[PDB]
Write a protein that binds this ligand. Structure first.
Ligand SMILES: [K+]
Ligand SMILES: [Mg+2]
Lengths: 663, 216, 119
């Protein structure tokens, strides 16, 4: 390779890969995007450990060494970061398109200093709530532009996309179709068809709105649906996009006008960073003269809105802080350097303490070392006082697991190996079912209903885990979460068993729509869960391999691939092809093509026909049109639009390329 | 199951080819037995017999139909509660007990029982090994075993054998194993070649039934 | 030790599904496999020629204990008849048999020193 692109979690592991192999000399530079996540995040702390580890290593050799290029938004303590990394600093306020941040109260629009800049009057009045939200969107569209409309909840976005699209139908004509006849009639049709041929299908609300250049966008949608909408909006096919805060931190997506519906997001006042990420998407370089931002408020929330327009970002925290003498991030940082073998003695530990971002701002370290000693993570030998890794230590590092989590996992696995159920895959799935964060709001009454209907083989697994029927009843009768007490990890257990059931149907190739109706969770939450469990399953497998647990490793090593695509064991071979997901793999399997080998000798036009059969239609489906011989109705990654013929031809070509590399 | 005798006429055609008929009913009784124990199917083209999954599995495993019944239940029993921390429980499933490979000294057995680690005592209980029966073996040499439910004897004999197979695949010297258990090197070597074959059978049997986790 | 009624197995399997968890634990702890109950409804194969097929008596015994449970739970004779499918004659003959047997097992436990069990 030359350039490896990683996320934060994956990059930190790769660095650790380089420490065990001493191939640190391969790495020439690291580029960090969004440097403000150094401060506070679910994973933002990994960015510091990553950088600090580099700063500690480059110090042990103290012509060029390791270069660091970091970039972010305007931070108050930005000079502190450049000094910590011994980096030269640069800061600018330049912006090719001037941003006009404003706030609307009633009909009046004010700037940051509460001076009136426009008295707004709606060109055609419509009914509803109407803080001139539709009229504002209409004004932008008429000037042949596009508008981003940010809403608090997922439900408002769909409701608003519906109102706007509905009014767009009445007003243009002055009184679920085909797109109007312009130069783009073909591409609006291509978008809906691409949505149709997806594991999710074509959303009911989108079928109404998309024909009129209107759409919504939130985390409830699948990642493939969101890739389509973002592309459509970026091309101009969609003129109005009602989104959530998910997009504001997502990919680069600019617009002429940005509208924020309210300064109250999720029942709480809006964060400043979120605000700057929304209004930052106003103004297209090379297209617009200005970018306008409008924050709609009332007189009551009037004062709070101005606070955002004048507000500024908070200083970057270290995420390694001391009430408590010990902290998770510190324990982990120390584990990586001792087990990795770059900090052995006691003097090296405090040398590392100098390289931290925490010390750049101007004991606890010794407390973390003892913690690693108490929990058998690290060893001390009598050449006075030198610290070494244990098997539990070396296992934890290679698994990329958190030392705090490793303790409960290690005990739980030993518990499973004393009495294990093998007749189904449920018990194995439970061991690789992640529960460090909530992926959905579980309806407990529904849960209890599935409990009664649950077969005996899976009830045995429930009991073997910790699931008491009494607790499930005490969840439905009273919404008492309790969980203040630490031993009330009892809550996580029932949440974990609920999740494993979902993962069971998922690898049982149950349709996303059935699973949504059965459990009551959207397709967005499911897909986010499987990508989490696929990663976690790999960790527990590595953890079992480094501990010598062969029997346990043997059972786990098949669920990482199955959780990823959501398939059964038979389709594991087909899904090696890039274009083949769960659905396409099944219909090709049911038609005689079981392996890549069977797929390389395959006739292209036959594959094309089989693909046409896996598609979901609203009428019980599955004109001689010689105009659809060229319709690009198949989506890819880094994509050119693919026709059903080209996709079929690519699959057979790819199958052939893989088969040859196997010999 | 092999598919060379399908109908009822073919069965008696086979009866003519036997060595038993060369010397010059019962066949029909065996067919019903295969029906009662779900080994074979009967469809309504009157009266044609077909193999089940249990049938096709038994044939491919080269197992005796009489033995297959107890094996099929025992495996289902193991999959309801299985110990994975050691290889003992797995070895028990592939430990053959259709013939005696040695004369077991029960007093020695009880001595190894007390010294046995907790992880392997859990496997003993999970199988059927009661400490009371081991004591009743040392005190009095009462084999009993006239009653059919006294397959209880085979269980303790089987668990004794699995211990031997455990040390064997743990690369313990043949001389240590001889002194520890009290069996000659001839009996041990004859046992491992028997268990190697049986282990392959149970693996095939598990594969044809779709029991992937167990096969693995 | 004797059959007190002709048990309808399909009805039995229906009561099995509706059975609370506390009583399913007792069923498993005894020998009751759900697979065997299904193989009773699908095919009326009694087998029981083999001695180890005392497995039949176990499911028959657990069926009977359910009846005795409702009986000492003061459930009307008419409900029990409709629920299980046995006449009032067979039930009453059963309880007088179980009352005697219960006394035997109690004495048996007392003479062996099993105080906790006797209690
Ligand atoms: K793929
Ligand atoms: Mg950026």
């Amino acid at each position: 390779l030359d350039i490896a692109v990683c996320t934060i979690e994956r990059a930190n592991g790769l660095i650790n890969r380089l420490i065990e192999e001493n191939k640190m000399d391969l790495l020439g530079m690291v580029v960090v995007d969004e440097l403000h996540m150094l401060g506070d995040s679910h994973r933002g702390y990994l960015l510091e450990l990553l950088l600090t580890k580099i700063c500690y290593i480059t110090r042990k050799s103290a012509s060029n060494a390791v270069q660091i290029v970091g970039m972010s938004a305007t931070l108050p303590n930005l000079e502190l970061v450049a000094s910590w990394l011994n980096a030269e600093l640069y800061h600018t306020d330049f912006r090719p398109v001037p941003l006009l941040e404003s706030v609307k109260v009633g009909n009046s629009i004010y700037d940051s200093s509460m001076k009136l800049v426009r008295e707004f009057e709606p060109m055609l009045q419509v009914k509803g709530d109407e803080d001139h939200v539709v009229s504002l969107c209409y004004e932008t569209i008429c000037d042949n532009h596009s508008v981003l409309l940010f809403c608090p909840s997922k439900k408002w976005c769909e409701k608003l996309a519906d109102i706007i699209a509905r009014e767009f139908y009445n007003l243009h004509h002055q009184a679920s179709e085909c797109p109007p006849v312009i130069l783009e009639q073909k591409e609006l049709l291509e978008v809906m068809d691409q949505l149709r041929r997806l594991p999710s299908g074509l959303d009911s609300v989108l079928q109404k709105t998309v024909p009129w250049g209107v759409a919504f966008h939130h985390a409830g949608l699948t990642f493939e649906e969101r890739d389509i909408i973002e592309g459509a909006f970026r091309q101009g096919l969609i003129r109005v996009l009602a989104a959530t805060s998910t997009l504001s931190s997502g990919v680069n997506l600019p617009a002429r006008r940005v509208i924020i519906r309210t300064p109250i997001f999720g029942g709480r006042p809006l964060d400043i960073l979120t605000y700057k990420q929304m209004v930052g998407r106003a103004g297209r370089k090379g297209v617009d003269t200005v970018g306008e931002s409008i924050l709609i408020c009332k007189n009551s929330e009037k004062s709070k809105g101005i606070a955002l327009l004048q507000g500024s970002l908070k200083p970057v925290r270290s995420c390694l802080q001391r009430g408590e003498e010990v902290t998770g991030s510190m324990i982990r940082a120390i584990l990586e350097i001792i087990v990795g073998g770059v900090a052995s003695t006691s003097q090296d530990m405090h040398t590392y303490a100098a390289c931290t971002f925490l010390a750049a701002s101007m004991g606890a370290i010794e407390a973390c070392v003892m913690w690693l000693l108490e929990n058998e993570f690290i060893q001390s030998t009598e050449e006075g006082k030198v610290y070494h890794p244990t098997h539990l230590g070396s296992a934890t590092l290679s698994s990329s697991l958190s030392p705090a989590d490793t303790l409960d996992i290690f005990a739980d696995l030993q518990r499973a190996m004393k009495g294990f159920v093998l007749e189904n895959d449920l018990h194995i799935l439970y061991l690789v079912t992640p529960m460090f964060e909530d992926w959905t709001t579980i309806d407990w009454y529904r849960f209890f209903c599935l409990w009664e209907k649950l077969p005996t083989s899976m009830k045995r697994v429930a009991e073997l885990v910790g699931v008491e029927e009494g607790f499930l009843a005490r969840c439905v009768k009273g919404k008492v979460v309790a969980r203040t007490e630490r031993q009330h990890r009892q809550m996580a257990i029932h949440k974990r068993f609920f999740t494993s059931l979902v993962l069971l149907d998922l690898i049982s190739e149950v349709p996303l729509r059935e699973i949504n109706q059965k459990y009551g969770c959207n397709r967005g939450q499911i897909q986010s869960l499987q990508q989490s469990a696929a990663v976690y399953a790999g960790m527990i497998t590595v953890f079992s391999n480094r501990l010598g647990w062969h029997n346990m490793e043997l059972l786990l090593s098949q669920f990482q691939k199955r959780l990823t695509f959501g398939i059964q064991r038979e389709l594991c071979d087909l899904v090696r092809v890039s274009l083949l997901n769960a659905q396409r793999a099944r219909v090709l399997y049911a038609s005689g093509f079981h392996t890549v080998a069977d797929l390389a000798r395959a006739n292209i036009v036959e594959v094309e026909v089989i693909l046409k059969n896996a598609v979901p239609f609203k009428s019980a489906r599955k004109e001689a049109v010689e105009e659809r011989r060229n319709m690009r109705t198949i989506w890819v990654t880094g994509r050119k639009g693919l026709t059903e013929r080209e996709a079929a031809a690519l699959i057979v070509e790819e199958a052939r390329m893989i088969l040859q590399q196997d010999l």
